[PDB]
Amino acid sequence: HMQPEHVKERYKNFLNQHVGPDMSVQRCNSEIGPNNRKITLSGTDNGCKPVNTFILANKRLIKTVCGRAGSPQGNMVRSNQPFPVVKCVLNNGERHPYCEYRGTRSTRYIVLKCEEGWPVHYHEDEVN
Ligand SMILES: [Cl-]
């Protein structure tokens, strides 16, 4: 429960954007939208993210990728085993409440950036 002060907000936002143990392929719009997580494109006024991946696992398991269950990839880490994910890809909309997505489930190695052992960034594919 205790977190480094400079990590707290980045970690909170990592959980919000990317930790979705209960997420499903057909709930991208509801989960991303203002009735739930209100996930927004960084640096924008309520802008729809082009892509947002939810890892279908709990935060405890995902955090282990920052340590024993990951391997180094530059200054990031790559999971040693793959995870189930739902990738939400933008279909329509500029800003909330109009962000509409298609969700696709896959199993994939996840690449994260960690700080002090805490996940702070999920590395999305360049093209989605
Ligand atoms: Cl790996």
Numbering used by the authors: -2 to -1, 1 to 126
Tell me what the authors wrote about this structure, in their words:
Pyrimidine-specific ribonucleases with homology to bovine pancreatic ribonuclease A (RNase A; EC 3.1.27.5) are remarkably widespread among vertebrates. Current structural data indicate that catalytically active members of the superfamily typically comprise a polypeptide chain of 119 ± 15 residues, have an α + β topology with three conserved disulphide bond positions (SCOP12 code 54076), and employ a catalytic triad of residues (two His, one Lys) to cleave RNA on the 3′-side of pyrimidine nucleotides. Recent surveys of the data from zebrafish cDNA and genome sequencing projects have led to the identification and characterisation of RNase A homologues in this species.
RNase ZF-1a cleaves tRNA with a specific activity that is almost identical with that of human angiogenin (hAng), i.e. some four to five orders of magnitude lower than that of RNase A. This is the first report of its activity toward a polymeric substrate. In RNase ZF-1a, the anticipated binding position of the pyrimidine is taken by the side chain of Glu122, which makes two hydrogen bonds with Thr51. This is reminiscent of hAng, in which a similar obstruction is posed by the corresponding residue, Gln117.21,29 One residue upstream of the obstructive residue, the main chain begins a deviation from the neighbouring β-strand that marks the beginning of a novel C-terminal conformation. Overall, the C-terminal conformation is less obstructive than that found in hAng; notably, Val125 points away from the B1 subsite, while its hAng counterpart, Phe120, encroaches on the pyrimidine-binding zone. The segment is stabilised chiefly by a network of electrostatic and polar interactions involving the side chains of two residues from the C-terminal segment (Asp123 and Asn126) and two residues from the main body of the protein (Lys85 and Arg106). In the region of the C-terminal segment, RNase ZF-1a bears an obvious (though incomplete) resemblance to hAng. No other known RNase structure features a Lys residue at this position. At the B1 subsite of RNase ZF-1a, the position of Lys85 and the correspondence of Arg106 to Arg101 of RNase 4 suggest that this enzyme will bind uridine more avidly than cytosine, whereas in RNase ZF-3e, the positions of Thr86 and Arg107 suggest an ambivalence as for hAng.
